[PDB]
Amino acid sequence: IDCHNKETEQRLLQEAHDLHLSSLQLAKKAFGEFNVQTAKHYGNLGRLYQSMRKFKEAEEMHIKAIQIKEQLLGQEDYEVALSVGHLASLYNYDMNQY
């Protein structure tokens, strides 16, 4: 995001996408769908999709992250707060769901 060349922007975004997808698959195979680590992977994917201008499924990623974080860590927890903060930053800045 802090770069200026658009080709470099897209290439590093896709590299981060590949790294997050590989990490998500490893975590999902190891632990399972309902875990904090998989939820962190989902939140990383959501914020990356926000950074990749794909805001339609960024909301889906963030809500999938929060519904797993708040189910295990309760409605009030640090990871839950960070994930809902990412979702709010997605809503108010780019998806115009003020």
Partner: peptide
């Protein structure tokens, strides 16, 4: 700085 920091490592 649009977003917050990463969840964890």
């Amino acid at each position: 700085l649009t977003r917050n920091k990463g969840p964890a490592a």
